[PDB]
């Protein structure tokens, strides 16, 4: 006990904390290992995802090497602050912290061969720009970028410890509106004016779930358009009936579009769902204009040719519109 105490104090003694291991020698080599716990809500409005993980950095420091005391020591909160650790940081994070309750979720373990293992429990909100042009039929690519802040590749090299097995816990993710199709681990040397900095990238590919939108967006619009087509089969002299039908279908379409864009994320630029809804709106508007033409031509100014043409052309045109939309966006 006291032997361990005085040996740890001696290990602290003679240690320069501002100097990395092997300052004049070859660069330090740090192996990263991530254990994902969960991916929380993913925001289209903010274009970011919140990720919780256990982040581990493994390296070798000959300064912190001891002989005897076969057990591997474990510094916890106070003397841990008196050791050099890499200045690793997440390039694209927007807000992150180490969990505090009950105690600081940090760990430092020193093996007798000078090896150091530094574990942290980190929650981080990372930026993920999204291509919301095929929304809700879109597929996204989010990334987490890990980089050294001050040291270039000549001083520190990073790598994935364990190779492709470095990152674990991907299966634990249970996002409601997204499914993780694939993930990748990449290592690069980004070149700045100062020099080549190390970089690691943990990338996920997400595919959105579509049945929600099929249930609440595409089906009601199609049903409302089919209802709007009923005017062509209603008698042409039923002015109040046909006018009420057409204008109320238009009102229902506007109601659907407005409340849909209220409940959906803001997303202040064009999507695919907007084009589909606008197509349905134009179809019902054209149906009402068709009745207006009928009323002016006949009964104003043996079914009539205008309605006979409408009955066959409107479903046919809507089918072609659906075909073009689905082929273009799928």
């Amino acid at each position: 006990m006291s032997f361990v105490k005085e040996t740890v104090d001696k290990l602290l003694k003679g240690y320069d904390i501002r100097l990395r291991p092997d300052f004049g020698g070859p660069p330090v080599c740090v192996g990263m290992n991530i254990d994902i716990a969960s991916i929380d809500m993913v925001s289209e409005v903010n274009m970011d995802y919140t990720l919780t993980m256990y982040f581990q950095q493994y390296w070798r420091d000959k300064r912190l090497a001891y002989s005897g005391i076969p057990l591997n020591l474990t510094l916890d909160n106070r003397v841990a602050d008196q050791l050099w650790v890499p200045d690793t940081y997440f390039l694209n994070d927007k807000k992150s912290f180490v969990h505090g309750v009950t105690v600081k979720n940090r760990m430092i373990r020193l093996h007798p061969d000078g090896t150091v293992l530094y574990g942290l429990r980190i929650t981080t909100t990372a930026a993920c720009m999204m291509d919301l042009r095929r929304y809700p039929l879109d597929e996204q690519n989010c990334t987490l970028e890990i980089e050294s802040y001050g040291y270039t590749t000549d001083d520190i090299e990073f790598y994935w410890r364990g190779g492709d097995k470095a990152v674990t816990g991907v299966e634990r993710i249970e996002l409601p509106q997204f499914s993780i199709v694939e993930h990748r681990l990449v290592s690069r040397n980004v070149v700045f004016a100062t020099g080549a900095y190390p970089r690691l990238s943990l990338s996920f590919r997400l595919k959105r779930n579509i049945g929600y939108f099929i249930l609440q967006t595409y089906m009601p619009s199609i049903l409302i358009t089919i209802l709007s087509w009923v005017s062509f089969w209603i008698n042409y002299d039923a002015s109040a009936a046909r006018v009420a039908l057409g204008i109320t279908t238009v009102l229902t379409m506007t109601t659907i579009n407005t409340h849909l864009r209220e409940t959906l994320p803001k997303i202040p630029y064009v999507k695919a769902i907007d084009m589909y809804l606008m197509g349905c709106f134009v179809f019902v508007f054209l149906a009402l204009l068709e009745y207006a033409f009928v009323n002016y031509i006949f009964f104003g100014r043996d079914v009539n040719a205008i309605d006979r043409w409408s009955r066959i052309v409107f479903p046919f045109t809507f089918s072609l519109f659906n075909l073009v939309y689905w082929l273009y966006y799928v």
Partner: nanobody, 108 residues
Framework: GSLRLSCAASGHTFNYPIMGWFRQAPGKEREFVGAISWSGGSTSYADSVKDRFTISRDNAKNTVYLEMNNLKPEDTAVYYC??????????????????WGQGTQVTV
């Protein structure tokens, strides 16, 4: 040799999302063959049989399919299916898995 095993789950399947396939040859202990998540993505296979086997899922009927393309004579064993909690731990350790199956037999 196209063999397809099927592990069907009933009950509170949501509370035990991850499902893992193991194999136990005669004499040898249980070995982790594969694991599949709830949503059907992010499958994880062992090093020995990473490319030979493929695991699929369909929650509409609560069943997990383990396909095998090319079988070797070291693969003769009793194949088990198991379920794991959401905060159990690692995938490769059978102790973390709570509910096991009787297990089928395969010989080649």
């Amino acid at each position: 040799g196209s063999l397809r095993l099927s592990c069907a789950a009933s009950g509170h399947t949501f509370n035990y999302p991850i499902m893992g396939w193991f194999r136990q040859a005669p004499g040898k202990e249980r070995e982790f063959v594969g694991a599949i998540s709830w949503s059907g993505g992010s499958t994880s296979y062992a090093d020995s049989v990473k490319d030979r086997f493929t695991i699929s899922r369909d929650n509409a009927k609560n069943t997990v399919y383990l396909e095998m393309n090319n079988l070797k004579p070291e693969d003769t064993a009793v194949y088990y299916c198991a379920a794991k909690g959401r905060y159990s731990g690692g995938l490769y350790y059978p102790t973390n898995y709570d509910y096991w199956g009787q297990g089928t037999q395969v010989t080649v």
